[PDB]
Design a protein around this ligand. Structure first.
Ligand SMILES: [Mg+2]
Ligand SMILES: [Mg+2]
Ligand SMILES: [Mg+2]
Ligand SMILES: [Mg+2]
Ligand SMILES: [Mg+2]
Ligand SMILES: [Mg+2]
Ligand SMILES: [Mg+2]
Ligand SMILES: [Mg+2]
Ligand SMILES: [Mg+2]
Lengths: 77, 100, 271, 149
RNA sequence: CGGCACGUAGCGCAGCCUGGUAGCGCACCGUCAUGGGGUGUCGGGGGUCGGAGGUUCAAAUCCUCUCGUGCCGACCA
RNA sequence: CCCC
RNA sequence: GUUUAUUAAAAACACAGCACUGUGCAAACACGAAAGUGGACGUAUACGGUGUGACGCCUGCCCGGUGCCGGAAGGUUAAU
């Protein structure tokens, strides 16, 4: 599912209003990629399916915290 | 078995190791009961025009008699590797053991 | 050879059968026989993908070695065979120390020949060796694209590729289409063209002659009705449009190549 | 973007200095190889206490082992004999595995990563120069004699 | 609507800034050339640089505005 | 260059 | 040979042939929000699309218009 493993960001719908307001339907998806982060505690790599705003969030927080968060949320890493 | 004056040029690269190639060039014929006549190694000389943009060439001649099924073999030998270049063969004429 | 069938009846007036008497007429080597189930135009989701396709006679896939990784053991050609899959004749060849295996016919082989693949081999049709251990300007078949994938290139009857140059650790190739690319030199290939070089003029003369090869009729669009093909519709053969696929895309024209992941290798495209 | 250095960098850094490096350079290359650490207070405390005088200076010690492995080879010349390629080129192009075994079975402690070839792989036959690096600071020079078996 | 680019004798054009006297073919008239002709030469008329107004010691060649005539973008009384 |  | 089951079986459809055009193989193209699958366990003497439609004599002029393929010289021109 296109959901960020770290933020829960998911696809959300909306509209595609043109210049005359025809208002067809349209989606909005995350800038979602599959990165191979590092984890010193385990001395390993870890492959996640994350977003750009999750890339900066692990910069800020740290790859230990986010893991406790995800473990208490009940998701496999 | 016919008399030939096959000659060929050689790159300066392997020009120095042609002594190690002489005996193997000639063994294919000697074991064939061939007759060697002369081994004129002209050596390193200046070419007259650029051969693949070169500036020198090591000439060597064979002056030998051999049969066709092995003379063609040595020909394709010269032709496969890249150490010989611009070879030539003569036919049917008597041996010449002179004229350096 | 090619035989202009005698016009005993309609359906032979224009036939030609490429027939070779040197190949085996008996039975193949079972241990290299896998079933090949027809899936005419229809994928896992039904909903036929490719048109113009259909049924045909039952075939049986032959396990053919393109990789040729025996790399240093000789092999004697036991015999030939006719694989109905590609276009070409197959050659069953057995190695000195056991295994028998199938390969492609390099247009010049006859039963009883001896061959060998690897880097310390000779230069004869049917020997397979890396392009770094190759004389340039040669003519080859069954060329790889990666060092070990097995071979994806120039393996249809009569074809070949003339190596033109080697750019250090890479190799320039001229395909039998006009294109010339640049691949890695640690690849592997086999010398010589490929057999059945006269399949080009294998005429059919008959509908069944293809309708059992697997072909199924493909229908002109300007006969279809506009609901089914842009060219459809019209009182009395009126095109008045631009030739396009059933799905809108234009044919006879537009280039569809939009890869960008391989143009690093293509030196000079076709023209 | 404000990352702290662990030790000497190849460029743009010396030690304990904070720089506006790029994230692409930080997350992938620096932090996981042990050459930098983001600018937080725990890490700053760790640095000014246990690194600026202790761990950096211990990292200066292994320079000794580096200069040692630089010239450990009692021969400084390794002869490899595999096969003669028809008087010309070589059959098996010598890469990294062909040398990582001849060094381990010789005594010179070198890994498949410590070898650095100047111009790709060698496909000639002749005694040629190759450069070894046990460290970004210590570069050795060992000659090889390419022979046939 | 904004921006640009054409407009020089009948025609087609450089001159389309690096401001100085309107020039070059094509047409046209006349010689000359030729045994009689074509081009060929030597010439002769025919333009005020689309108009208007400035900048100028001077305009065409510079600015502005207009009149055509095209192109590209705009435009929810 | 064409042309009687 | 096929077709308008149930008012039209043919000059209509398809056909082996010819041509054009596309596609270098993680093919091009199609079914799919996607993973994947057919193409093909094939890989340009191969595959897809288009048209005409055995064989024989043949395939005339026009690139103005539309579409397609090449050039980026210049003018115009979106977001930021
Ligand atoms: Mg609505
Ligand atoms: Mg098939
Ligand atoms: Mg057809
Ligand atoms: Mg009509
Ligand atoms: Mg009409
Ligand atoms: Mg019926
Ligand atoms: Mg796909
Ligand atoms: Mg137009
Ligand atoms: Mg275009």
């Amino acid at each position: 599912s296109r959901v960020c493993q770290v933020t829960g960001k998911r696809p959300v719908t909306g509209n595609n209003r043109s210049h005359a307001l025809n208002a067809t339907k349209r989606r909005f998806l995350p800038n979602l990629h599959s990165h191979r982060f590092w984890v010193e505690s385990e001395k390993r790599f870890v492959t996640l399916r994350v977003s750009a705003k999750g890339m900066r969030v692990i910069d800020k927080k740290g790859i230990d915290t986010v893991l406790a968060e995800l473990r208490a949320r009940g998701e496999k890493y | 078995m016919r008399h030939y004056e096959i000659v060929f040029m050689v790159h300066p690269d392997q020009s120095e190791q042609v002594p190690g190639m002489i005996e193997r060039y000639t063994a294919a014929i000697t074991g064939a009961e061939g007759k060697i006549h002369r081994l004129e190694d002209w050596g390193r000389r200046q070419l007259a025009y650029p051969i693949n943009k070169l500036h020198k060439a090591h000439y060597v001649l064979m002056n030998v008699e051999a049969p066709q099924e092995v003379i063609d073999e040595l020909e394709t030998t010269f032709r496969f590797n890249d150490a010989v270049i611009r070879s030539m063969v003569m036919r049917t004429k008597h041996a010449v053991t002179e004229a350096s | 050879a090619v035989v202009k069938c005698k016009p005993t009846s309609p359906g032979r007036r224009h036939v030609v059968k490429v027939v070779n008497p040197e190949l085996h007429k008996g039975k193949p080597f079972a241990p290299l026989l896998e079933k090949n189930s027809k899936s005419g135009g229809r994928n896992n989701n039904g909903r036929i993908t490719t048109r113009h396709i259909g049924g045909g006679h039952k075939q049986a896939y032959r396990i053919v070695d393109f990789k040729r990784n025996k790399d240093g053991i000789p092999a004697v050609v036991e015999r030939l065979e006719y694989d109905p899959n590609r276009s070409a004749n197959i050659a069953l060849v057995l190695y000195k120390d056991g295994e028998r295996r199938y390969i492609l016919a390099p247009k010049g082989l006859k039963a009883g020949d001896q061959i060998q693949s690897g880097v310390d081999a000779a230069i004869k049709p049917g020997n397979t060796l890396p392009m770094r251990n190759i004389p340039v300007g040669s003519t080859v078949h069954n060329v790889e694209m990666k060092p070990g994938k097995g071979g994806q290139l120039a393996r249809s009857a009569g074809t070949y590729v003339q190596i033109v140059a080697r750019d250090g650790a890479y190799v320039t190739l001229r395909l039998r289409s006009g294109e010339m690319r640049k691949v890695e030199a640690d690849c592997r290939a086999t010398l010589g063209e490929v057999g059945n070089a006269e399949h080009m003029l294998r005429v059919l003369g008959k509908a069944g002659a293809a309708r059992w090869r697997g072909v199924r009729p493909t229908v002109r669009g300007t006969a279809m009705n506009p609901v089914d093909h842009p060219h459809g519709g019209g009182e009395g053969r009126n095109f008045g449009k631009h030739p396009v696929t059933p799905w809108g895309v234009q044919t006879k024209g537009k280039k569809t190549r939009s890869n960008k992941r391989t143009d690093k290798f293509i030196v000079r495209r076709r023209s | 973007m404000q990352v702290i250095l662990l030790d000497k960098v190849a460029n743009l850094g010396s030690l304990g200095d904070q720089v506006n490096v790029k994230a692409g350079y930080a997350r992938n290359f620096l932090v996981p190889q042990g050459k930098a650490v983001p600018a937080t207070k725990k890490n700053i405390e760790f640095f000014e206490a246990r690194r600026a005088e202790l761990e950096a200076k211990l990292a200066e010690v292994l320079a000794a082992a580096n200069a040692r492995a630089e010239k450990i080879n009692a021969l400084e010349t390794v002869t490899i004999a595999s096969k003669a390629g028809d008087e010309g080129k070589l059959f098996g192009s010598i890469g990294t595995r062909d040398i990582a075994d001849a060094v381990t079975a010789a005594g010179v402690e070198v890994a498949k990563s410590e070898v650095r070839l100047p111009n790709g792989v060698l496909r000639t036959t002749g005694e040629h120069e190759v450069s070894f690096q046990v460290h970004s600071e210590v570069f050795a020079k060992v000659i090889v004699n390419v022979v046939a078996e």
